[model samples]
Target: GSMSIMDHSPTTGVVTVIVILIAIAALGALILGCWCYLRLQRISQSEDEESIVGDGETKEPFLLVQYSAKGPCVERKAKLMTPNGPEVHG
Candidate 1:
């Protein structure tokens, strides 16, 4: 016979189980990180643009600048105050 299948180490099976468990833990952490990231984004944008009012002394509305990114690409959106109220320009 050229070769015979055999287990040289009695702990090989235990090591295999440990490796699998580590891989599963790493995958779970990755998924959790992604979920938290998405949740944070939603929380940040939860507030829609609201008019800043109060003080009898009216203040002129100015353009609001917003910055965001997708992957390695980043872009900015400018919101201007017009007769129609705040309008977003991308």
Candidate 2:
């Protein structure tokens, strides 16, 4: 006579919670932390203007460009250099 042996394990409360909640949630938590890391990295990659007005001491610029919410603003701090005193050469 051949007899069949049945082996079964019952799901406990803590095991059920671990299996249902924190098992797959480990990867979700990893992705969320990685997303926050990239978000801060993106903020750190932005640029800021060095001089808002003008800081031309040695190498003076011809004009200073400034933009507003409505229109454009420019300052003619330095004069333009011509080749033959405004000869209009092409």
Candidate 3:
């Protein structure tokens, strides 16, 4: 016995349209996700004036903070040699 196979053809136009729509939707989703993530992060941030008083410029903020006896202090009490005057946070 012999088996016969039938030829099948797919519509290039329909496939192209579907692929384009999917691509658009994927791009939109990626953009929306990034926007939402940034918005949420900003919302969780503090609006305290004292906290953002003098954080204008600093090279490495993580290691610039002062370790006081009480706790970690943002500003240094003694004289600082940094250009930003030791006003920064990690």
Candidate 4:
């Protein structure tokens, strides 16, 4: 056998580990995205019910601009606002 840097020993174990880690990461991302989607859906659905209950509110999508405890941000999202009322960001 030629004793050269190019003739390196095969490292099958390292390659196998990398493949397993990648698979776990991909699965986690898929689960998290679905959860977030469901949460947002629930929030919007509840607001729809309130709009028709003597609040005189209309279900209109508006660009939201507010701050939160999580971060300092200018958000552009949709919500329902009552007649002569403030915007609700659920």
Candidate 5:
């Protein structure tokens, strides 16, 4: 039997909606910021090509790729163990 202040508040639904919208907008901005932040790395790579070695510049890559055993390589291992031989009867 809890008497609460929110029980009398009519703006609760509106307030909840506003807060949810704000949270969605904030999260959307954060996602976009992360995306832009990643892209900016590529921009820097292009801007300072001399600092990075080899033909890495001429490639003119966008969306800065991160190379690691646990990154892109993880998804490609799906075909790593394909059986090329016929099954032998026991």
Candidate 6:
């Protein structure tokens, strides 16, 4: 016979279980990510029916340039000015 017997070390059962668990978890995470990506792609593609832009002058997205945080930094119980007369604090 060309076989050898009397082994000193053998592979254990827990090793196989751990390998299988890691493989299962990896596959589950990747598959879920791919599914969500495809779903979002379809939703974005379905936005082809976008609204048309205006032709006349309706104020092309008005923008304002103002001081950052230097415009009256602290609270002040100062003067008050109003159109309908209300105690406006600036």
Winner by lDDT: 5
lDDT of 6 by residue, 1-48 (tens): 323752432434556777887885574355335432122323575432
State the lDDT of candidate 1 residue by residue for 1-90, as single tens digits.
323544565457877899987985574465345443222324555543221222111354331121112311221121122231113321
**Candidate 2 on 1-90: residue-level lDDT in tens?**
223532233346667888867854674354345432122222445532212232212233432222221111211211133222123531
lDDT of 4 by residue, 1-90 (tens): 536642454545666787877875574354335433223334465442211221222323321121121111211233223231123323
Q: Which has the greatest TM-score?
A: 5
Model 3 deviation from native, Cα RMSD in Å: 20.0
Model 5 lDDT tens row, 1-90 = 335655666578989999998996685465345443132334464443221122223345522243223223532552264331224310
User: What are the root-mean-square deviations of the candidates from the true structure over C-alphas?
Assistant: 20.0, 25.5, 20.0, 16.0, 16.1, 23.9
TM-score, structure 4 vs. true: 0.30
Off by over 4 Å in 6: 1-11, 37-90
Residue 88's lDDT within candidate 6 is: 41
Q: Model 1's lDDT to the true fold? A: 0.36
**Cα-lDDT of candidate 3:** 0.37
Output the worst ten-in-a-row residue range by lDDT, candidate 6: 63-72
The 10-residue segment with the lowest total lDDT in model 3: 48-57
Cα-based TM-score, every candidate: 0.30, 0.22, 0.30, 0.30, 0.31, 0.28
Overall lDDT per candidate, in order of appearance? 0.36, 0.34, 0.37, 0.35, 0.42, 0.32
On a 0 to 1 TM-score scale, where does candidate 2 land against the true structure?
A: 0.22
lDDT, candidate 1, at 86: 19
lDDT of 4: 0.35
Which segments of candidate 5 are over 4 A away from where they belong? Answer: 1-9, 37-90
> Where does model 1 exceed 4 Å of error?
1-9, 37-90
Candidate 5: residue 32 lDDT (0-100):
44
Q: Write the per-residue lDDT of candidate 3 for residues 18-69, one digit (tens) a residue.
A: 8987985584465345433122223456532211122212334442242122
